[PDB]
C-alpha cells in the first residue's frame, strides 16, 4: 500500500495485456520482475488502468464536497 | 477520463523518471508516443505513482465505510 | 566496401531471421534501419552468418600459406 | 568455426561498441548471453566489423584468380 516492486508489476501487466509485447519483454528484465516477489495469478486483469480511473474519481470527489 | 494515450503517457513518464530507460526507449516507440496530444511540462513527476496511490486510498475508503 | 548501414542491415536481418524478434524490433529503430539505401529483396538469407564464415577462412588460408 | 552462440556474442559486442546501448541490452537477454560459453575478454574490439571485411576480400580473391 503501495511499494516500489508492485507499481512495477501493475505496469508490467499493463504492457503484456495492452499488447506491447516488446515493452513487456524489456521492462520484464529491466524491472528484475522474475525476482519481484508478487503473486501474479493473484492480481486482476487491467489492474493498472482501473486503480488509476479511481484515483482520478477520488480527486473528482474531493473537489465537489469542498 | 481516461483514454489509452493518457495511461500510456503516464507510464512512459514513470519509466523515465524511475530509471528504466531501456524500457522507456522501447515503450515510447511501440506506443507511438511522439504523436501524443499531451503537454509533458503539464505532467508532474511521480504522476503515475501518486495517482495510483489515490486509487488504493479510494478503495480502502469505500471498504471501511461499509 | 563497407558502410555502417551495410553492416547494420546485415545484422538487422540476422536478428529477424534467427528470430531475435524483440531485439530486431529495437535495433531496427536505434540503427535508423528504414532510412537505408539497401534493397532487402536483394539481401540473401543467412546474409551475415555466411559472410562471417568466408572471412574466417581468409584468416586460416593466409596462415597456412606461410 | 562457426557456431550459433559464436556469431551471437560477436554481434552482441558490435552492438555495445557501436554505442547501440538499447539493442545491446535487449539482445543481451534474447540471445541468452549470460549462458553463452565465450570468454568475453578473449574476443578483440571491432571483432564483427573486421571478420566481415575479410570475408568480402576472400570473395574478391576468388573472382580474380578466375
From Swiss-Prot, chains A, B, C, D:
Query: Which tissues does the record link to its expression?
Result: Ubiquitous.
Reported effect of changing residue 42 to A/E? Does not affect interaction with NCOR2 and GPS2
* Domain LisH positions: 3-35
State the compartments where it is located.
Nucleus
Mutating residue 44 to G has which effect?
Does not affect interaction with NCOR2 and GPS2
Q: What does this protein do?
A: F-box-like protein involved in the recruitment of the ubiquitin/19S proteasome complex to nuclear receptor-regulated transcription units. Plays an essential role in transcription activation mediated by nuclear receptors. Probably acts as integral component of corepressor complexes that mediates the recruitment of the 19S proteasome complex, leading to the subsequent proteasomal degradation of transcription repressor complexes, thereby allowing cofactor exchange.
Q: Which family does it belong to?
A: Belongs to the WD repeat EBI family.
Entry comment, domain topic: The F-box-like domain is related to the F-box domain, and apparently displays the same function as component of ubiquitin E3 ligase complexes.
The UniProt subunit note reads as follows: Homotetramer; dimer of dimers. Component of the N-Cor repressor complex, at least composed of NCOR1, NCOR2, HDAC3, TBL1X, TBL1R, CORO2A and GPS2. Interacts with GPS2 (when sumoylated); leading to protect GPS2 against degradation by the proteasome. Component of a E3 ubiquitin ligase complex containing UBE2D1, SIAH1, CACYBP/SIP, SKP1, APC and TBL1X. Probably part of other corepressor complexes, that do not contain NCOR1 and NCOR2. Interacts with histones H2B, H3a and H4. Interacts with MECP2; recruits TBL1X to the heterochromatin foci. Interacts with USP44.
Q: Write down the disease named in this UniProt entry.
A: Hypothyroidism, congenital, non-goitrous, 8: A form of central hypothyroidism, a disorder characterized by sub-optimal thyroid hormone secretion, due to insufficient stimulation by the thyroid stimulating hormone of an otherwise normal thyroid gland. It may be caused by congenital or acquired disorders of the pituitary gland or hypothalamus. CHNG8 is a congenital, X-linked, relatively mild form which may be accompanied by hearing loss in some patients.
Protein's UniProt name: F-box-like/WD repeat-containing protein TBL1X
Q: Which species does this protein come from? A: Homo sapiens
Amino acid at each position: 500500500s503501495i511499494t516500489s516492486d508492485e507499481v512495477n508489476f501493475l505496469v508490467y501487466r499493463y504492457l503484456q495485456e495492452s499488447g506491447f509485447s516488446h515493452s513487456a519483454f524489456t521492462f520484464g528484465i529491466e524491472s528484475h520482475i522474475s525476482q519481484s516477489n508478487i503473486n501474479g495469478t493473484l492480481v486482476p486483469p487491467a489492474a493498472l488502468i482501473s486503480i488509476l480511473q479511481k484515483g482520478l474519481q477520488y480527486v473528482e470527489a474531493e473537489i465537489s464536497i469542498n
